[PDB]
Ligand SMILES: *Cc1c(COP(=O)(O)O)cnc(C)c1O
């Protein structure tokens with residue numbers, strides 16, 4: 001059986017931390033709120049969920065979370081409207097994804113709606129920490145880790161679920177959208193079919209640090225993850241990739257790679273697909289995109305916009321790709337970027353409550 | 364630049380724990396020793412290395428070790444002979460591998476010989492925990508984790524290196540060879556002992572058990588290359604297609620973890636000079652043909668925990684493949700086990716052993 005939100009214990013902080021305040025820079029994931037959610041799992045099942053003061057974790061040196069990466073995480077945002085109302089963006093999908101990640105690592109199952117209610121209560125306690133300035137939000141970070149005090153590679157008989165919160169600034173401060181340049185080198189592979197790249201597991205990220213540093217040395221901001229001998233475009237850093245172009249059959253379309261096992265099923269990715277399909281102005285498809293297809297479309301002037309999608313960036317433009325020592329210029333910014341700006345505006349209006357929408361979950 | 368063993372902080376335990384005996388045969392890595400090594404790193408450099416009592420770690424909930432798997436480990440054994448002398452098996456190779464793993468994850472550099480001396484001093488302190496019975500030893504587990512209190516995916520500005528010790532204690536195994544499960548890929552990180560390569564294997568091992576097998580035979584590529592057996596390297600002893608008797612193991616092209624036992628078996632077999640010893644790709648097609656022609660003598664896995672482990676069956680594409688390992692002695696396996704034990708327990712003096 002799962003832990004219940006009705007069994008939630010609340011321990012308030014005796015020493016509250018000084019809040020950043022409007023005007024001061026909010027660097028991504030470095031500032032933390034006053035409280036955290038904590039739920040323990042053992043042989044007898046789940047314990048009662050607790051909202052306790054922000055504090056360090058006490059782990060046994062042999063904890064399987066530190067030796068065999070029995071760890072997963074989620075990432076979603078809570079937004080504060082001008083009237084101080086806080087709302088979460090499609091959290092049910094993050095709960096769905098978190099459970100799939102738990103099953104892949106043989107970690108304990110939980111009830112998705114009970115966890116969501118526990119998270120709603122946590123954000124409610126720390127509601128004053130959610131910033132209200134343009135483009136700002138509260139990043140919610142749920143984590144489930146194996147906590148077995150054994151060096152055997154096996155299913156944990158002990159686990160720990162915790163949630164921490166971070167007030168974060170605008171990804172594009174000032175409102176102006178800025179593009180990223182990408183390094184596309186086939187020597188670096190993020191995931192493989194039959195692997196775990198389609199799950200938000202800690203293991204998929206650590207190996208990317210060295211690759212990102214190589215991208216920075218070569219003058220690029222992020223990595224374009226290529227897959228297969230045909231160099232299929234999969235991800236842009238930790239974002240899903242979208243290409244807005246006129247296809248080889250002459251039809252205007254928005255394309256993104258299909259969920260074949262090497263793509264992480266993003267919540268923003270699904271939201272852009274749902275939004276574009278509702279408009280019905282162009283074809284919306286999930287199909288494999290190769291470097292040779294992109295190269296042919298660029299020389300024929302068929303590419304309008306290329307972008308990445310994700311919780312941190314929302315919609316991020318791509319203007320340059322460094323491939324085979326040659327610089328490929330993508331006319332994303334010269335085209336507005338019309339579609340990116342339209343997606344950003346509509347997401348902003350839904351997120352900050354300007355538009356009523358079923359996608360938003362009130363806190 | 365690096366932490367020094369000369370700068371070692373010693374904090375001996377008060378109120379020690381009860382040492383186990385053969386009254387209850389212990390499970391692998393569940394019983395721990397009295398002390399542990401601990402070294403902290405920050406952007407200004409390494410702190411003082413400490414031998415302190417076995418205690419819990421205190422980590423910030425945003426520690427990069429827990430979110431982005433900035434973690435690596437090592438595994439080596441210490442053996443106690445009849446004259447009570449404790450010796451480590453080729454630890455210099457484990458230190459080489461650990462530093463390579465560290466660089467791959469953008470974790471801090473350290474001097475390999477300074478860490479080895481700190482580990483020697485730690486085992487020296489907990490010397491009475493190392494058992495002397497047949498087939499028993501002390502498993503040494505060094506770990507290096509990222510410890511930056513940031514949710515940004517970046518090079519950690521804080522790290523933690525710790526070492527814990529475990530007193531630990533031939534039957535063949537059956538393997539599941541399903542191409543649907545991939546452990547590692549060329550261009551990936553399967554050739555490094557990173558925590559991230561192990562968590563995803565738990566469900567695959569459960570699938571092996573569900574299908575009646577004991578371990579997983581990891582296949583790679585369109586030609587179904589045999590890469591690893593569980594957390595062990597794979598060896599095949601056969602008469603190859605050219606009619607020559609040989610011992611083969613997959614090469615270090617990126618999908619194979621460079622095992623210390625693997626290297627030791629290759630070195631030992633090369634020194635004898637009785638048959639051909641090579642590093643070459645082994646495919647399921649080659650194995651199937653060799654089994655039908657009666658050319659396979661023995662197949663086994665190698666690693667610190669299991670040492671030399673016989674394989675008697677492989678379940679591939681819903682077909683059972685009997686490997687005649689046990690019906691061929693197992694001559695080579697027994698010879699490897701005998702010679703390793705002689706070197707390990709100090710019956711025969713060798714340069715491979717590091718005295719504690
Ligand atoms: C987190 C992530 C995404 C985007 O997911 P969102 O749910 O949209 O935040 C895409 N790709 C990778 C590799 C990711 O880790």
Ligand SMILES: *Cc1c(COP(=O)(O)O)cnc(C)c1O
Nearest residue numbers: 594595596620622623624666667
């Ligand atoms: C640890 C390990 C080995 C064996 O290495 P040894 O140094 O010989 O202990 C082989 N393969 C994998 C996947 C391993 O994790």
